[PDB]
Design a binder for these strands. Structure first.
Ligand code: GTP
Ligand code: MG
Ligand code: MG
Ligand code: ZN
Lengths: 199, 386, 131, 136, 52, 263
RNA sequence: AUGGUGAACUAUGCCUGAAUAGGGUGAAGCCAGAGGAAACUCUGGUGGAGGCUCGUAGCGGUUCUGACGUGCAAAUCGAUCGUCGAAUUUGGGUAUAGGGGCGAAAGACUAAUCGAACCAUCUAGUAGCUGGUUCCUGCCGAAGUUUCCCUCAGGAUAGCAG
RNA sequence: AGAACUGGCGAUGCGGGAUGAACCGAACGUAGAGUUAAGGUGCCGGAAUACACGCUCAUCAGACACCACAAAAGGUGUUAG
RNA sequence: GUGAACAGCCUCUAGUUGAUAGAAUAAUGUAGAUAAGGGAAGUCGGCAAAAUAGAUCCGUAACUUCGGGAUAAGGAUUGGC
RNA sequence: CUCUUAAGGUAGCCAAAUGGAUUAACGAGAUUCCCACUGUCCCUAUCUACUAUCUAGCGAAACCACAGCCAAGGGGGCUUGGCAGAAUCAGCGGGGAAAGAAGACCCUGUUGAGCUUGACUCUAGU
RNA sequence: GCAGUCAAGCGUUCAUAGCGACAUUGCUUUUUGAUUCUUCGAUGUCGGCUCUUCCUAUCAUACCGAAGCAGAAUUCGGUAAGCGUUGGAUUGUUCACCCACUAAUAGGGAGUGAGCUGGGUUUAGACCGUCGUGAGACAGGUUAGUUUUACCCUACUGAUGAAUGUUACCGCAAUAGUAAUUGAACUUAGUACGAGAGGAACAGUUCAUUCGGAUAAUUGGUUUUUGCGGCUGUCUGAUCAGGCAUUGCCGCGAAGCUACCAUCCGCUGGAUUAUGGCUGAACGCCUCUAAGUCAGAAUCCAUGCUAGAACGCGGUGAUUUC
């Protein structure tokens, strides 16, 4: 029982914690695709959701055997037989948990942007100036270095004009292309210009 | 099993065994160190405390919620008639304890100390330091040799004193003895002091002042044989339980096959020697300096003593110490007041106190009038007066 | 100390005090508010049916009549005749604002007294005319 | 004390224990408030969490508006009925037990408190003292 | 919480002791040591009342 | 403890029958067991019994058996030791289920349902004496008991079962006899329930009382007429609400949920 | 098993005597008044019914973490409770006797004795199993194994010792 | 686990194994002297704080049930191959 | 005499004044009480206490075998002269 | 050999006022809830009498191999340690083959006797 | 677990007679966090009030280490048992669950079957079910039901005490016990850190939680002070002054006892753990370790506090005239 609910605790905090990619808000719903891949994201959690259920099943089935155990040896073997199965289920979870651990680290470090506030996007080619605008309009630490893709994600900074919080968004830069294929770096900006309101 | 509901024990195992003390007189167990440099100073005074009363003040405690705001409290009065010095004992330090090796006495001693040494005054021919002072004739010599001994050896000097119970409203004639330690520097200064103070007297001001964290010891209020329930603070078993509801129900187990030293039983309660420490002196009064109960704030010329006196006790006609809170012990005892053992500016022990009104209402009933002048004025003319 | 005076005069089981009854019989607003009232759901006679003297709701209109003709009523009607006792009295008796106490007794003698009597006349008319 | 209570809370005698009905002083439309827990209360064996004047308690409405019923909510006590000592020397007590309902920050539901709010409760919580008509 | 015995607190306190907080005590010892000397001289005059 | 007692009598019985409150049989059905039975144990036969066919009108019972005889056989039934309906119908039905299993030597028959629906009473009205205990309270039977008739058939009776669905909701579990009304904390809040279920004419006929608005009135006007109120002089909300919620489930006040519309 | 003695306790029947405050309710009958063709239908009385009701003495014995447990007592004491005009309580007389009586049925009661009273005799009833079994020294000194009776018990028989 | 044989105990003290049904020694009349068995020789305790060659430092070594169990391995612990 | 009362309480006539005593006033008991604020949070369980109580007048529901239920419930009073 | 789903709108036709046991009343019968009230409880404190207690007189009983401090080991006493100072009083309820309810609750007898059946053999009665 | 797969090795010597560690593949039910309302025969007693102690396998408090540890909050690990670990609801049962406070509501052992109980031992009464031709017994289920010590020895708690010349006063301290705990307020600050949302801490101050030791000025409680007054019934011819009502009842009531229901007080020196270091070999680099050495946890030993060995000890007073 207690080893069961050790796992069914630990997984439930993952499933409850992670942001629930559809039914967020279409800007974010997109952005987490363009970073983490939405199918791998949804699978990896759903694996953990399945592995939650099998541990409960294994707990509930063995406990019901273990009430007919007629000696110490039989009971001891049934116990080890339960905990081996749980260990086997969790050993089969090596690839998702390694994936999720790294998305957790990244997704914490995203900037909060409100879609609903007054914003402004700041877009163009690489190497134009449009970071050093964001550096000088607002307080923010974004790098100003003479080569193409220095910024690789959406940076943010706020400023008050007319006693009102705005938010600038510096955004890595776009090339012209055949436009079916552009990069996960470039696509952030396109979805930023698409989804968000604002100037 | 494992109790299944953790809960503190009942009572302190430090204060044990819970028995009767050896004497109506808690003996001091420790004195402050010996900053061999300072001027010589008595470390403890013994008096008789005999009161309780109610002092307001305003409490210039920067920080607290009562800053610049008037507080009431309880303070106890220890009456403290001046002490007189009649011996010195020198203790040599050893690989074993501290050994004393020389008591010296004051030529002439009061009837009081003599009465101490006697269990039946009303017969004994009173034949004590007679033979002692007999020796003490001629250049006295012998005593000089013994003082010399102390100077030479010895690593603390202790002063013997007594009280003047013949000045307390108390009636017991027999005075006490004590010992008190001198703290100033060298055996030489200590012993010279004691000599140039033999037969002399030491007041209460010259051992204390206002605002001073002093700690009292005493052997303190007896209630005789008492119950397990009101000796340790145990619960009472529900109601109409067989073989009584005022007790610890389970007292033991199959192992060990013994009642244990930790299971709160019935026995004595009170008449233990307790130390309570960090009590602040408030007001040190002088039996001459009339208008004690007055204040820079009151001016209303009146003594500490309340109407119809204190209860079970007279009228305070001498150096009285006020304190705050409650010394252990009941009215008429003897509390020995030890100072501090350690510097202690827990910033409390610092705020210079100013009393705004001392209560001198009757304690033998419900207080209503301070001075009988107040009372009479209020009532007006009564019957037989006029 | 003992059981009767405890379990009548706990703080929980307190009656209204005579000062405030005097002040509610003083002026014809605070009478006629208490005579009318709304329909309360809580109070015995669904509101209504209320001696102002003994500050007390009855069930019925009939069990008012039997109350009014009784020594438990006439008890309080005597108690509310004079000056109703406040801190001004017990202060003045020491010797401490006499002049405020005397100005109060003057106004209760002259202005308030016969007003509050002439209300009690209209209570005696109103209750007996309704009943 | 926690959130809302400004400054050091100071000791007074514990009037109300758990499961003890007290009146509602504010004008939200609760009649009376049944105490179910006391915030900032200790743990002792067999002891009952006792509130006092100027303490935050979880409280269910027993009689009142249907909306306010059927849910626990915080409340500050404003009259005690059990006597307590002021540190200027007098013991005192109010006519009856009373509370006012409020959020965990210490901000009030009702616009005005009827009756005399206690003096310690006014110092400790500012937003009670704003809705207090009568202090003491 | 920190205990009574905590090294941080007792190392803190010992810095306080030395400074302002013993100076109070070492003034008070000098205030009393006067009164103990001035207590004698009264009693030495009380002898000189008899020596007259 | 009771769901264990259930899965016993399903495993023991050779025809489960499933009794249904003929006020509101869709609410008082349960899925769940029937979904289990088809998957695990198809050889167990299964059959509804509408009963409390007194407590609705005659067309309504006739309708419900029409709308349920689609999925399962059904009887309309009414249980009393003396004065029954459907008794010879049900015996006839069981004696068929026996004569199919002519090898068997015996055939047990179980009585699953919600609480307070009439399992123990149906067993009594088959036997024609008092054999199981009964009461107006929900939880009267606490454990199974075999009861013989005809030698070759045995009746069983498990205790009642609620399946633990999220909705449901609290008032929905109330207005079929499941909760003992004594233990609910505020009964007052649920009375707008019975005003919704009942026709106002019927509720006006019963007590008796005349008109109002809101339940909070309806309790007060009732409680003043009943004379049922506390010392000085508050009308009793809790107890009078408590008694209405009883009279509802006991069958002193007439209501019924409608069948599906005809076609 | 034989032959005796018990109904002074107690169970039931019979004959003859005795005993049981004060309140609450208010049945039939009857009177007056108000309606009616009559049956009778309302109002006010009177009257004093009942295995009715509150409750004394009486008879009983519910409950209490009751008192007391070599006790006052081999069943008591205290409080609380049931019933209290009759299928009531009770004195004396009388009938029923043991494998019987008597039983508003508990295998209750039948002299502190009851799924079969008490007393004497046959009688030292029966021993499977338990407990006990009385001085000294010297010398010799085992056996827990076969084999059969269908088996367990109960044993026959061989072997070991003098 | 069930068969076969031979020892030991039961009817049996005594020496040693700190103590002990089955382990090591051991032919019980009463005494004296001598010499040993098994086991021992820092002190308790009769008898070498003997002699000789090596190995070991354990922040609770080892002094042993041994020809096992936890056992197969982990160590920048030491010595010899 | 009080009162509805051969209830309880106090008296007259008549009859007892018998029960091992004395000195203290610890804990634990037996019997009996009171308690701020809260008011069943106690407990398996409101067990046990508390509260109610006599009389007069107002008033009295569901159900009913129409007799009851009913002292339902719930109110207003009580001395002395 | 062939064969069984019709009843329709908030209360229906019907049968000798009712459709009933969902039965009034009664209960030291069993159980749940609400008001009132409270030391049941938070949390205990105090008071009265009679005990206990000390004295004078009087003066039993249970029970009793001998005993009476602990730790570890021996498949209360022995082995190895801790230790250990006369004589005692009031409490106390842990331990004492200190008792004591000690029988129970299982197992075995060919053994007791109470009761019942187409068990065997008889038998009153009919 | 079963069935294999690779192969560091065992198998007297040994690759391919059989074994065989560490790794590793097979499903026990759908790859898109859907639900998955699955509750499927414990044939044996435990469960709880009171109270103590122990273990650590640490839930919280102390100090460290590691993490995308920016703060803030948290997770994982190390030393650590000094000190805490609660309030209620639920028996149509609770081998559990929920919601509420909380710094936290960790897990165990010896339990508390003679200290007291509730279920169950458990007999005689009774009813319903199943089985039996029946007497009866049980797949059940429901209700009613007397075991009552201590006065003995020991242990535990308090209390006296002969004898070491007599007697008195003042002291030392072997040994034993030992105690304090947790939170948040101001200030540092709206600073550090942050694009923002938000947001600390050491110095310096103030209160409370749990626990402990006292104490009774004041507030509350208690009243045979039967202190003063009042009330009913009866009794002393009436007033008066009183009696009885198992302390007759009501009010107030000093004294005494007493309550987080009232007030006061509760510490600072040495040596360490984890870890962080210094010089520095072994080993011509290097290393916190081998020799040596500095810091450092609520730990440990003292200080302080309680008792004072009745076979531990010191200082000092007086020492009978028939
Ligand atoms: N009018 C009517 N009432 C019925 C009928 N059957 C049952 N009832 C009522 O429903 C109540 C419940 O009967 P039960 O048999 O206890 O219901 P149950 O849940 O099966 O009973 P348990 O099995 O003991 O839980 C009884 O009080 C009956 O009065 C019916 O046919 N008609
Ligand atoms: Mg760039
Ligand atoms: Mg039912
Ligand atoms: Zn009035």
């Amino acid at each position: 029982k207690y080893t069961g609910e050790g796992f069914v605790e630990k997984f439930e905090d993952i499933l409850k914690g992670f942001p629930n990619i559809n039914d967020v808000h279409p800007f974010h719903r997109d952005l987490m695709d363009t970073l983490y891949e939405k199918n791998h994201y949804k699978i990896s959690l759903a694996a953990i959701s399945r592995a939650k259920s099998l541990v409960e099943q294994v707990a509930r089935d063995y406990v019901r055997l273990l009430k007919f155990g007629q000696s110490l040896f039989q009971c001891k073997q049934l116990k080890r037989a339960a905990l081996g199965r749980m260990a086997t289920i969790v050993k089969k979870l090596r690839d998702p948990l390694a994936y999720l651990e790294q998305v957790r680290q990244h997704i914490g470090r995203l900037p909060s942007i409100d879609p609903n506030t007054r914003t402004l996007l700041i877009c163009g080619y690489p190497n134009v100036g449009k970071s050093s605008f964001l550096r000088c309009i607002t307080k923010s630490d974004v790098d100003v270095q003479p080569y193409a893709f220095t910024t690789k994600s959406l940076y943010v900074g706020h400023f008050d004009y007319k006693y009102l919080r705005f938010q600038a968004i510096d955004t890595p830069g776009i090339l012209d292309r055949p436009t079916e294929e552009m990069n996960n770096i470039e696509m952030q900006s396109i979805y930023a210009i698409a989804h968000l309101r604002s100037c | 099993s494992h109790r299944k509901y953790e809960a503190p024990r009942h009572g302190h195992l430090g204060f044990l065994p819970r028995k009767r003390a050896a004497s109506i007189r808690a003996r001091v167990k420790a004195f402050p160190k010996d900053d061999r440099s300072k001027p010589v100073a008595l470390t403890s005074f013994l008096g008789y405390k005999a009161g309780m009363t109610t002092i307001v003040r305003d409490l210039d405690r920067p920080g607290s919620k009562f800053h610049k705001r008037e507080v009431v409290e309880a303070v106890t009065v220890v009456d403290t008639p001046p002490v007189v010095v009649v011996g010195v004992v020198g203790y040599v330090e050893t690989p074993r304890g501290l050994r004393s090796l020389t008591t010296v006495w004051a030529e002439h001693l009061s009837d009081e100390v003599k009465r101490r040494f006697y269990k039946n005054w009303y017969k004994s021919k009173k034949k004590a330091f007679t033979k002692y002072s007999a020796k003490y004739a001629q250049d006295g010599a012998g005593i000089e040799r013994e003082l010399a001994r102390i100077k030479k050896y010895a690593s603390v000097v202790r002063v013997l004193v007594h009280t003047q119970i013949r000045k307390t409203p108390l009636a017991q004639k027999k005075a006490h003895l004590a010992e008190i330690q001198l703290n100033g520097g060298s055996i030489s200064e200590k012993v010279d002091w004691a000599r140039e103070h033999f037969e002399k007297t030491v007041a209460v001001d010259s051992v204390f002042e206002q605002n001073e964290m002093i700690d009292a010891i005493a052997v303190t209020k007896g209630h005789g044989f008492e119950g397990v329930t009101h000796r340790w603070g145990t619960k009472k078993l529900p109601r109409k339980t067989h073989r009584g509801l005022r007790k610890v129900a389970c007292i033991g187990a199959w192992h060990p096959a013994h009642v244990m030293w930790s299971v709160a039983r019935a026995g004595q309660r009170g008449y233990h020697s307790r130390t309570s420490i960090n009590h602040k002196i408030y007001r040190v009064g002088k039996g001459d300096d009339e208008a004690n109960g007055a204040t820079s704030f009151d001016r209303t010329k009146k003594t500490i003593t309340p109407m119809g006196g204190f209860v079970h006790y007279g009228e305070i006609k001498n150096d009285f110490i006020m304190v705050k809170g409650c010394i252990p012990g009941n009215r008429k005892r003897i509390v020995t007041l030890r100072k501090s053992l350690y510097t202690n500016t827990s910033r409390k022990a610092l705020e210079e106190v100013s009393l705004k009104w001392i209560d001198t209402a009757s304690k033998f009933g419900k207080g209503r009038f301070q001075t009988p002048a107040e009372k009479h004025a209020f009532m007006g003319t009564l019957k037989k007066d006029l | 100390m003992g059981r009767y005076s405890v379990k009548r005069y706990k703080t929980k089981r307190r009656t209204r005090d005579l000062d405030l009854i005097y002040n509610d019989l003083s002026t014809k607003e605070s009478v006629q508010k208490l005579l009318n009232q709304p329909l309360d759901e809580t109070k015995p006679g669904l509101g209504q049916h209320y001696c102002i003297h003994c500050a007390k709701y009855m069930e019925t209109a009939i069990a008012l009549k039997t109350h009014l003709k009784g020594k438990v009523h006439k008890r309080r009607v005597k108690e509310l005749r004079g000056v109703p006792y406040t801190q001004e009295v017990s202060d003045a008796a020491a010797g401490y604002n006499l002049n405020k106490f005397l100005n109060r007794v003057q106004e209760i003698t002259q202005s308030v007294g016969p007003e509050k009597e002439s209300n009690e006349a209209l209570l005696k008319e109103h209750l007996d005319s309704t009943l | 004390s926690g959130n809302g209570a400004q400054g050091t809370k100071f000791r007074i005698s514990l009037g109300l224990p758990v499961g003890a009905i007290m009146n509602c002083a504010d004008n939200s439309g609760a009649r009376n408030l049944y105490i179910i827990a006391v915030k900032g209360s200790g743990s002792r064996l067999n002891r009952l969490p006792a509130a006092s004047l100027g303490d935050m308690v979880m409280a269910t409405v027993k009689k009142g508006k249907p909306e306010l019923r059927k849910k626990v909510m915080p409340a500050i006590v404003v009259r005690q009925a059990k006597s307590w000592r002021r540190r200027d020397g007098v013991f005192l007590y109010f006519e009856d037990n009373a509370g006012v309902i409020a959020n965990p920050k210490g901000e009030m539901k009702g616009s005005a408190i009827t009756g005399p709010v206690g003096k310690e409760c006014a110092d400790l919580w500012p937003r009670v003292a704003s809705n207090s008509g009568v202090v003491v | 919480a920190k205990s009574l015995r905590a090294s941080s607190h007792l190392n803190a306190k010992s810095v306080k002791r030395r400074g302002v907080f013993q100076k109070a005590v070492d003034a008070r010892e000098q205030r009393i040591s006067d009164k103990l000397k001035e207590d004698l001289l009264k009693q030495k005059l009380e002898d000189l009342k008899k020596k007259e | 403890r009771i769901w264990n007692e259930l899965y016993k009598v399903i495993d023991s019985s050779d025809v489960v029958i499933h009794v249904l409150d003929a006020r509101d049989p869709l609410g008082t059905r349960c899925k769940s067991v029937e979904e289990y039975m088809k998957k695990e144990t198809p050889h167990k036969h299964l059959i509804y019994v509408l009963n409390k066919c007194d407590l609705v009108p005659t067309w309504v019972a006739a309708a419900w058996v029409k709308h349920l005889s689609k999925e399962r056989p059904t009887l309309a039934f009414h249980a009393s030791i003396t004065n029954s309906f459907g008794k010879g119908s049900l015996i006839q039905l069981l004696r068929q289920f026996s004569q199919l299993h002519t090898d068997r030597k015996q055939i047990s028959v179980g009585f699953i349902g919600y609480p307070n629906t009439g399992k123990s009473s149906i067993i009594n009205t088959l036997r024609k004496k008092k054999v199981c205990q009964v009461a107006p309270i929900p939880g009267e039977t606490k454990v199974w008991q075999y009861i013989t008739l005809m030698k070759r058939i045995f009746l069983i009776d498990c205790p009642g079962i609620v399946p633990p669905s999220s909705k449901d909701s609290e008032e929905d579990i109330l207005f079929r006899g499941v909760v003992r009304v004594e233990h609910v904390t505020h009964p007052e809040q649920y009375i707008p329930g019975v005003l919704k279920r009942c026709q106002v004419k019927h509720l006006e006929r019963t007590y008796e009382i005349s008109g109002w608005k809101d339940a909070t009135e309806f309790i007060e006007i009732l409680a003043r007429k009943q004379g049922r109120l506390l010392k000085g002089g508050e009308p009793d909300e809790s107890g009078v609400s408590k008694q209405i919620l009883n009279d509802f489930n006991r069958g002193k006040i007439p209501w019924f949920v409608l069948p599906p519309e005809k076609e």
